[PDB]
């Protein structure tokens, strides 16, 4: 996974800037769980 990225529990990688933004970007909302 990439540095400016965040790894979901999906194994999915999203831009780390989508972590904590009131959108579910992982599709298991693990980008939103800890905010």
């Amino acid at each position: 996974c990439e540095k400016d990225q965040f790894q979901c529990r999906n194994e999915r990688c999203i831009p780390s800037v989508w972590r904590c933004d009131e959108d579910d970007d992982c599709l298991d909302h693990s980008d939103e769980d800890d905010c």
């Binding site: 400016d4 831009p15 800037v17 989508w18 933004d21 009131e22 970007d25």
Partner: protein, 685 residues
């Protein structure tokens, strides 16, 4: 002939002879912010006021004092302090400064937390004679809790010269004490003020913000907060003193009315005014009327009037009213003041910093790296209702060009989307497309291109784009805008970097470099002062059979195309089939065509769906300047090539340069797997 009439610093008790009455008054400290003052405390029963003795005032007489009402941010229309006079020994009383354009001599709570100096010039407004003055709040039964207030440092006597230009206190009509930053025996000279103002209200720009909170109510811009004038008392917003000598504009968002239907007629207008003398006198810039078409949030951009141009101008928005009561509120947002009259020719950026003087507005945009950029880019990646960036005004001429690095989603989504790119010559009151959608329909063009250049598949990753600026972008004040039209998903991200809009690198670095401070920084494999000497031998030939994967040694760009058998044998084996839903575009590496004779290839339309109309025909163009300009070689007509045909064209002399590239592109199609086309056995030799 002009005696000092009253002076009181209250600095160990008042001077008895100054005053006839001060019911409710005490000596002490109130609101130790902007030592001894005359304080009128809430709890005190009865009249809260202070009255001078009778005074012989004349043509030259001013009243000057310090005051603080309420020590708060709570705007209220209740228990204001009125400065009044009497020509009949207190029999009746009148506002010293009526309301008109300027507010009355009434001092409301919440206007400023801190103390402020005030001055009224009696003799300019009123005749000479025997006169009485007071600062009156009201009369309070036990239990009442009116706002606390205080006066300090009261002077009644001759005005100083030029009134100290508004930037100083007047001692006895002979000497001025200039506010910090002001000097000269009249406070005329001004220390360098800023020539720029930007307030988003999402957060010293303002001297007062009276009658308005930061709210999300009544919004225009769905990013965030605005300034909501819904309160009672004084509705006024006042800028710091600004250097506007070379300013071009004042722009802002404004809405008049926040109601069900049409705002009522009795609603007082909002006044935009200016002052070159620290608030003493105000000239109208613009009246804003409540009307049947006012209840809607809208963009206002105004040119700086000649009379406002000075190293020390301040602006205000004020809504007049008799009694601090209002019929319909108003909202204001995104205030920018600035620009340059020199309207310079060069705006340049690598986004190591994000200067707002260059980038007026950037909703949805973040200073961050993305997609292996060099340092930071301006990035539109976060959750946004809106994504755009507007430049400040620059002057655009014959030698002016736009050059930016652009990137769409960088393999985040496979969406087909396009970023609009626009220009304005009327300060953003109206936007026009930079590149206007044009095709071989008429001699009306000789260059061919699409309105939507910045497309997501073509520009997946960082790609430079250089445009010589069209004649209709030539003005003294052209601003530019990158626009993502709504609706749009979040994952349709995009970004810009390495922006040069200007006239500093003639020839545009020949298409093989970027302009950086009037010098070319060349792309790898290129050197020289203007990037026109290649570092190695470019290939003299292009041959492709499409029996294997298109290589990076032949093609710079393949959009909408893949290897397929769907067409049958076009030449032989696999052909490169174009049937994608977005761009359908084929572009060669730069080729040394010094000694090249021809271009040839086999070609077929509609392996899936036959092309519907002329504009769906693939065009073949060449460039001898890194793709900055393209020259049509062939319109590959749509109704021809229903079965595979062979195309052989002689290179024109102007195409035979040391670095020539080719493109095939479809301007139009009905979308995925519609109006498709295939190319096989490409040969440039």
């Amino acid at each position: 002939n002009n005696p000092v009439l009253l002076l009181d610093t209250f600095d160990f008790g008042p001077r008895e002879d100054n005053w006839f009455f001060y019911p409710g008054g005490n000596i002490g400290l109130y609101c130790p912010y902007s030592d001894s003052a005359m304080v009128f405390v809430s709890n005190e029963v009865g009249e809260h006021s202070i009255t001078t003795r009778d005074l012989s005032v004349n043509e030259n007489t001013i009243i000057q004092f310090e005051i603080n009402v309420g020590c708060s941010t709570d705007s209220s229309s209740a228990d204001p302090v009125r400065l009044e006079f009497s020509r009949d020994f207190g029999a009746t009383w009148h506002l010293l400064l009526p309301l008109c354009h300027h507010p009355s001599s009434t001092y409301y709570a919440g206007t400023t937390q801190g103390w402020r100096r005030e001055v009224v010039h009696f003799g300019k407004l009123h005749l000479a004679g025997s006169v009485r003055f007071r600062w009156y709040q009201g009369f309070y039964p036990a239990g009442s809790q009116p706002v606390t207030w205080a006066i300090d440092n009261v002077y009644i006597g001759p005005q100083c010269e030029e009134m100290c230009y508004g930037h100083g206190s007047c001692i006895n009509g002979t000497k001025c004490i200039c506010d910090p930053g002001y000097s000269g025996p009249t406070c005329k000279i001004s220390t360098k003020n800023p020539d720029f103002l930007k307030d988003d209200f999402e957060g010293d720009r303002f001297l007062l913000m009276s009658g308005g909170k930061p709210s999300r109510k009544c919004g225009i811009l769905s990013s965030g907060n605005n300034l909501f004038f819904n309160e009672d008392g004084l509705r006024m917003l006042v800028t710091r003193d600004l250097d506007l000598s070379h300013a071009r504009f004042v722009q802002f968002f404004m809405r008049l009315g926040c109601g069900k239907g049409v705002p009522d007629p009795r609603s007082q207008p909002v006044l935009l005014q200016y002052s070159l003398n620290g608030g003493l006198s105000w000239s109208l810039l613009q009246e804003f009327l409540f009307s049947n078409s006012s209840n809607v949030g809208r963009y206002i951009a105004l040119e700086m009037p000649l009379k406002a141009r000075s190293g020390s101008t301040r602006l205000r928005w004020w809504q007049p009213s008799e009694n601090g009561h209002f019929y319909s509120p108003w909202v204001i947002d995104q205030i920018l003041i600035g620009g340059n009259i020199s309207g310079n020719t060069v705006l340049e950026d690598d986004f190591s910093t994000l200067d707002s003087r260059k980038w007026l507005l950037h909703p949805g945009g973040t200073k961050m790296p993305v997609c292996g950029s060099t340092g930071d880019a301006l990035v539109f990646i976060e959750k946004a209702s809106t994504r755009y960036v507007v430049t400040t005004d620059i002057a655009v001429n014959e030698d002016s060009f736009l050059q930016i690095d652009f990137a769409a989603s960088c393999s985040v989504t496979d969406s087909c989307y396009a970023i609009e790119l626009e220009y304005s010559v009327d300060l953003g009151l109206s936007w026009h497309p930079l590149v206007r959608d044009c095709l071989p329909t008429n001699v009306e063009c000789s260059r061919y291109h699409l309105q939507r250049i910045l497309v997501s598949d073509t520009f997946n990753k960082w790609t430079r784009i250089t445009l010589p600026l069209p004649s209709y972008t030539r003005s003294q004040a052209t601003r530019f805008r990158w626009h993502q039209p709504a609706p749009f998903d979040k994952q349709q991200t995009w970004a810009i970097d390495n922006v040069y809009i200007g006239d500093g690198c003639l020839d545009m670095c020949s298409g093989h470099g970027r302009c950086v401070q009037g010098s070319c920084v060349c792309d790898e494999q290129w050197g020289g002062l203007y990037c026109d000497e290649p570092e190695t031998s470019l290939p003299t030939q292009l041959k492709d059979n499409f029996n294997r994967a298109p290589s990076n040694q032949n093609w710079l760009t393949v959009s909408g195309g893949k290897l397929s058998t769907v067409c049958g044998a076009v030449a032989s084996g696999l052909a490169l089939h174009f049937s994608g839903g977005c761009s359908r575009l084929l572009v060669t590496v730069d080729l040394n065509l010094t000694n090249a004779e021809f271009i040839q290839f086999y070609f077929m339309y509609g392996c899936l769906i036959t092309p519907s109309n002329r504009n769906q025909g693939v065009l073949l163009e060449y460039s001898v300047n890194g793709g900055i300009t393209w020259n049509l070689l062939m319109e590959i007509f749509y109704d021809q090539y229903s079965k595979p045909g062979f195309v052989n064209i002689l290179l024109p002399p102007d195409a035979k340069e040391i670095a020539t590239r080719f493109r095939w592109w479809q301007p139009r199609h009905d979308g995925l797997d519609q109006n498709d086309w295939a190319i096989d056995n490409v040969l440039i030799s």
